[PDB]
Design an enzyme around this catalytic site. Sequence first.
Site, PDB file in Angstrom:
ATOM      1  N   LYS A 179       0.824  -1.200   0.000  1.00  0.00           N
ATOM      2  CA  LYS A 179       0.000   0.000   0.000  1.00  0.00           C
ATOM      3  C   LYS A 179       0.867   1.264   0.000  1.00  0.00           C
ATOM      4  CE  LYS A 179      -3.897  -2.259   0.160  1.00  0.00           C
ATOM      5  NZ  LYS A 179      -3.580  -3.635  -0.306  1.00  0.00           N
TER       6      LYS A 179
HETATM    7  C1  LIG Z   1      -5.594  -6.065   0.620  1.00  0.00           C
HETATM    8  C2  LIG Z   1      -6.929  -5.377   0.556  1.00  0.00           C
HETATM    9  C3  LIG Z   1      -7.765  -5.410   1.683  1.00  0.00           C
HETATM   10  C4  LIG Z   1      -7.317  -5.981   3.008  1.00  0.00           C
HETATM   11  O1  LIG Z   1      -6.308  -5.208   3.612  1.00  0.00           O
HETATM   12  P1  LIG Z   1      -5.353  -5.871   4.732  1.00  0.00           P
HETATM   13  O2  LIG Z   1      -4.623  -4.739   5.412  1.00  0.00           O
HETATM   14  O3  LIG Z   1      -4.374  -6.793   4.031  1.00  0.00           O
HETATM   15  O4  LIG Z   1      -6.223  -6.641   5.717  1.00  0.00           O
HETATM   16  C5  LIG Z   1      -9.058  -4.940   1.591  1.00  0.00           C
HETATM   17  N1  LIG Z   1      -9.525  -4.415   0.403  1.00  0.00           N
HETATM   18  C6  LIG Z   1      -8.719  -4.357  -0.699  1.00  0.00           C
HETATM   19  C7  LIG Z   1      -9.319  -3.784  -1.939  1.00  0.00           C
HETATM   20  C8  LIG Z   1      -7.412  -4.830  -0.641  1.00  0.00           C
HETATM   21  O5  LIG Z   1      -6.615  -4.771  -1.759  1.00  0.00           O
END
Ligand SMILES: *Cc1c(COP(=O)(O)O)cnc(C)c1O
Lengths: 365, 368
Positions: free
Chosen positions: B182
């Site tokens: 991210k």
């Molecule tokens: C990876 C992701 C999540 C989950 O996030 P985490 O921090 O890994 O639990 C939720 N929504 C989208 C669209 C993602 O790409």
Amino acid sequence: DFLPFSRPSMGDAELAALREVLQSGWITTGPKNQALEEAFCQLTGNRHAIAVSSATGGMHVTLMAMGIGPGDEVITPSQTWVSTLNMICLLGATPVMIDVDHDNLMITPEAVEAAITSRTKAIIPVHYAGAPADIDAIRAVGERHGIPVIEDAAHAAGTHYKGRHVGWRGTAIFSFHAIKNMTCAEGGLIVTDDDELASRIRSLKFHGLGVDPQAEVITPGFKYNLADINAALALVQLDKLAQANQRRAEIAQRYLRELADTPFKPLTIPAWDHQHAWHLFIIRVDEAACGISRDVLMEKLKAMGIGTGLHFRAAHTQKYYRERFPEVSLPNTEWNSARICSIPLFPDMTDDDVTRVITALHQLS
Amino acid sequence: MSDFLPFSRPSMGDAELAALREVLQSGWITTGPKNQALEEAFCQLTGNRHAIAVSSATGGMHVTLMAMGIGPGDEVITPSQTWVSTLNMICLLGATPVMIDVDHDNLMITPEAVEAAITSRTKAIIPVHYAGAPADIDAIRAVGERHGIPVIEDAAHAAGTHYKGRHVGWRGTAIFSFHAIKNMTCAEGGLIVTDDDELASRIRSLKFHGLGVDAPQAEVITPGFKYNLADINAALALVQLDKLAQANQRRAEIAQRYLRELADTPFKPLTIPAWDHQHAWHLFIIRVDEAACGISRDVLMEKLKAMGIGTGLHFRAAHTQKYYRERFPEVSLPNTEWNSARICSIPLFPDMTDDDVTRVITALHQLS
Ligand SMILES: *Cc1c(COP(=O)(O)O)cnc(C)c1O
Ligand SMILES: *Cc1c(COP(=O)(O)O)cnc(C)c1O
Ligand SMILES: [Mg+2]
Ligand SMILES: [Mg+2]
Ligand code: NA
Ligand code: NA
């Protein structure tokens, strides 16, 4: 100048481990997780190790992987941290709370056997304060009835029982929370000798992903994986654990000796062969014997700059459980829960820190 | 290995290490003042009232839906074109996911598709802000308001995303991710913003064992989970938030060059939405159609890898995965299915050099 009841031992070795992970660019689950799991297999002698984001999450997925749910009973002490009771309930199962030995605060095989019913699907003993429960006797009860025993080993990193590390066989869950004997701030690890259980756990802690081909969701799971930033810290802390526990033992031995001539009452050391990890040093404060109540002792120690903990307020006395299970009456638990506190015990304590605590307890008696 | 260009890499340096040193030296390594600072920072970033840091955006979704009372008998409208965490959390609360299609060119749900899927059992709508662009959240919110259904925004890709001049999550409820790929990361973590006082109170309790004060000392009011974020991680997130504006500026420069230099290739980026926004450029997604490109999506990914260039698949639609395919075999989502079989994410991260970008563009031209 405040002396807390616990503080981690973080130094240049931890920072150097963090630097290595950051420089690698691989900061979530990866090679450090694998090394931590292999290290816990070497530590315990058990077959499978699964690192997780907390021991609470570890308990959640372990019970889930065993198929525990509505209609199932899980035997557990009330005298433990609320995470275990909460996870049982949040899977739809029913906790069956049993009493503990009045002097070491751990469940007995007799109390487990008395609580078994046709609904019982798991038994969860707690190795309390760094001492092991009589796990062979508890395991024998489970084997007689075909009921698995899942060990809460949060306090038992470095604990030995009859010459082996806790979790050498069966299933046990360790915690790496900040006050634990080895820490990565938040984290945990499950050891198990059960191949199928280990396979299910690994999937259920990472979104239920598995191979039926490319990985895909086989059944819904949770997110409880441990980052390599944290796993690297845990590896350093595991390397320090033997020396940390030796220092904790030295402090605890001095508390045992120098509080012997005070009315404050430590826990009793179990009669079965063990090595104590000395996670907590707990004393019972009975106002009739000590001239001071547990709560007031905690307050006055704090006014003197000395921290204390409460491990733990029995779960069945807390609102949710008190109202859902009003019939539960556990005299040993209730007596101790109202009288225990944890005095400072961590390996960065100096001899003078220990003397300060002992002097204050003598003054307040 | 040293010459491999992955599709993402974090930007971790001396600033992150110095933040870690401060937390370790303090001795306060789990949830504490760095969590509070991170939450205040996200309130200032978004303009929203409440910020609750959590151990992952998945856990954040879990406790948010739980705090809303979502459970057996309830339907939750969501794309299949998203990460499986959301579908899983709906199911593991006992609720029923209602999977809807997405726009064929930006991969986000439309207000029309949401409205068509509403029933008397619908208790939440979960749009996804995809790849760094915002969904048309005012239109989706309007549908929710008309039916009295809350909208919970999956903003994992949208740290730094603006919509009509405001940061995503300026109102309503949104969940951010700090996972390693991210735009700002603390390896694993997330954060919920909300304008709902009662929801925030429930969430804070449910991410930390259900502890609360009875109507006295804290005690379990109702069972909760353990999804708190350590201060070690919160401190990393604060450094990464401080870097976010420059990191996103660099991501935009790279993405703009991809948009320009892939314009004369058959690879098809996502379309930029018509509503006013600022794109965070979390992912640069291309559609690979064998008829137009002369190469399939899977083969492109394999050949790029042989050239030392990594790619990701964000995402294989949830309803095509075993559990959901067999539980919900009736789900038929044409735009999702077409794209899911054809998308991949090419390298996009702010530590990429101009020469790294040229390498990717050159390979795509060669493989066309
Ligand atoms: C990876 C992701 C999540 C989950 O996030 P985490 O921090 O890994 O639990 C939720 N929504 C989208 C669209 C993602 O790409
Ligand atoms: C705190 C603790 C746990 C839970 O551990 P976490 O890693 O914090 O989730 C479980 N059992 C006992 C006895 C504990 O003290
Ligand atoms: Mg005594
Ligand atoms: Mg093109
Ligand atoms: Na020891
Ligand atoms: Na941008």
